[PDB]
């Protein structure tokens, strides 16, 4: 969750 | 230096395709069983809306689009009369992989399929006018590693006059902070808002975005992010305000 696409 | 005309009010449309909910992809595409919802993406859509409204564009948002829906939207704009506009912008906020972006259904849209809808033959009312695409997505699953450095009538081509701003070089990830927005879009908007009033052109601004994003890091994975513009622009592109 805290990070990319 | 030759400069694109940029005086119409509105300047043009700025489409924003803002993909958040990937429940369909998780259900339907085996390899995307754990692809996450893109929490925080609205912060990017809002930044782009503020930024491009200040620059006199008419914003056209579309949320949570499958691939087929994206192509339908792009066809609508391909077929629109842009004769009274000076520019067209399309922003895509989604997951992606090498050369593609995902619809919310987990189908793939090659980036070429998106931009090629606006060539001069397909959209003559944009012929000779800048067409600008910003793509916020990963382009693969690799972390970009870091390296240590010291501290500081006439005819033109069908594919002329494009600018494609990618959040990342191919093969690599791009970052989204759910509480702030993406590294790339947030930097892009900050730079546009600061520098377009100074008269700076978009390639200069995108160089600054490269500089700023290159200083960010992911200290979980020791990851970096390297944005990458590509262009067939034939003139300087400025967005006066």
Curated annotation (Swiss-Prot), chain B:
Catalytic activity, as annotated: Strict requirement for Asp at position P1 and has a preferred cleavage sequence of (Leu/Asp/Val)-Glu-Thr-Asp-|-(Gly/Ser/Ala)
Active site per database record: 95, 138
Residues bearing PTM N6-acetyllysine: 2
Post-translational modification: Generation of the p10 and p18 subunits requires association with the death-inducing signaling complex (DISC), whereas additional processing is likely due to the autocatalytic activity of the activated protease. GZMB and CASP10 can be involved in these processing events.
GO term, biological process aspect, one: apoptotic signaling pathway
Residue numbers carrying Phosphotyrosine: 112
Free-text tissue specificity from the UniProt record: Isoform 1, isoform 5 and isoform 7 are expressed in a wide variety of tissues. Highest expression in peripheral blood leukocytes, spleen, thymus and liver. Barely detectable in brain, testis and skeletal muscle.
Enzyme class, spelled out: hydrolase
GO cellular component, one term: cytosol
Outcome of swapping residue 138 to S: Abolishes interaction with UBR2
Main localization of the protein described in the UniProt heading: cytoplasm
E.C. number(s) listed in UniProt: 3.4.22.61
One Gene Ontology molecular-function label: cysteine-type peptidase activity
Activity regulation statement: CASP8 activity is restricted by RIPK1. Inhibited by the effector protein NleF that is produced by pathogenic E.coli; this inhibits apoptosis.
Alphabetical keyword list: Acetylation, Apoptosis, Cell projection, Cytoplasm, Disease variant, Host-virus interaction, Hydrolase, Nucleus, Phosphoprotein, Protease, Repeat, Thiol protease, Zymogen
Superkingdom, taxonomy of origin: Eukaryota
Family: Belongs to the peptidase C14A family.
Function of the protein: Thiol protease that plays a key role in programmed cell death by acting as a molecular switch for apoptosis, necroptosis and pyroptosis, and is required to prevent tissue damage during embryonic development and adulthood. Initiator protease that induces extrinsic apoptosis by mediating cleavage and activation of effector caspases responsible for FAS/CD95-mediated and TNFRSF1A-induced cell death. Cleaves and activates effector caspases CASP3, CASP4, CASP6, CASP7, CASP9 and CASP10. Binding to the adapter molecule FADD recruits it to either receptor FAS/TNFRSF6 or TNFRSF1A.
Subunit structure: Heterotetramer that consists of two anti-parallel arranged heterodimers, each one formed by a 18 kDa (p18) and a 10 kDa (p10) subunit. Component of the death-induced signaling complex (DISC) composed of cell surface receptor FAS/CD95 or TNFRSF1A, adapter protein FADD and the CASP8 protease; recruitment of CASP8 to the complex is required for processing of CASP8 into the p18 and p10 subunits. Component of the AIM2 PANoptosome complex, a multiprotein complex that drives inflammatory cell death (PANoptosis). Interacts with CFLAR and PEA15. Interacts with TNFAIP8L2. Interacts with CASP8AP2. (Microbial infection) Interacts with human cytomegalovirus/HHV-5 protein vICA/UL36; this interaction inhibits CASP8 activation.
Disease: Caspase-8 deficiency: Disorder resembling autoimmune lymphoproliferative syndrome (ALPS). It is characterized by lymphadenopathy, splenomegaly, and defective CD95-induced apoptosis of peripheral blood lymphocytes (PBLs). It leads to defects in activation of T-lymphocytes, B-lymphocytes, and natural killer cells leading to immunodeficiency characterized by recurrent sinopulmonary and herpes simplex virus infections and poor responses to immunization.
Domain comment, as recorded: The catalytic domain is sufficient for recruitment to lamellipodia but catalytic activity is not necessary.
Entry protein name: Caspase-8
Organism this protein belongs to: Homo sapiens (Human)
Gene name of the record: CASP8
């Amino acid at each position: 969750x805290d990070x990319x696409x | 230096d030759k400069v694109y005309q940029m005086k119409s009010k509105p300047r043009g449309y700025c489409l924003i395709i803002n993909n958040h909910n990937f429940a369909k992809a998780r259900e339907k595409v085996p390899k995307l069983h754990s692809i996450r919802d893109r929490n925080g993406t609205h912060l990017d859509a809002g930044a782009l809306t503020t930024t491009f409204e200040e620059l006199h564009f008419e914003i056209k948002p579309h949320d949570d689009c499958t691939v087929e829906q994206i192509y339908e939207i792009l066809k609508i704009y391909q077929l629109m009369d842009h004769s009274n506009m000076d520019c067209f912008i399309c922003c895509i906020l989604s997951h992606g992989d090498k050369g593609i972006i995902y619809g919310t259904d987990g189908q793939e849209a090659p980036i070429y399929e998106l931009t090629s809808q606006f060539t001069g033959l397909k959209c003559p009312s944009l012929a000779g006018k800048p067409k600008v695409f910003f793509i916020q997505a990963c382009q693969g699953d690799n972390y970009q590693k870091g390296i240590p450095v010291e501290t500081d009538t006439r005819y033109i081509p069908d594919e002329a006059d494009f600018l494609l701003g990618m959040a990342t070089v191919n093969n690599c990830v791009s970052y989204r902070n759910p509480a702030e927005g993406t590294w790339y879009i947030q930097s892009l908007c900050q730079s546009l808002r600061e520098r377009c009033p100074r008269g700076d052109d978009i390639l200069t601004i995108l160089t600054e975005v490269n500089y700023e994003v290159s200083n960010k890091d992911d200290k979980k994975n020791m990851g970096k992010q390297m944005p990458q513009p590509t262009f067939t622009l034939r003139k300087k592109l400025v967005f006066p305000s």
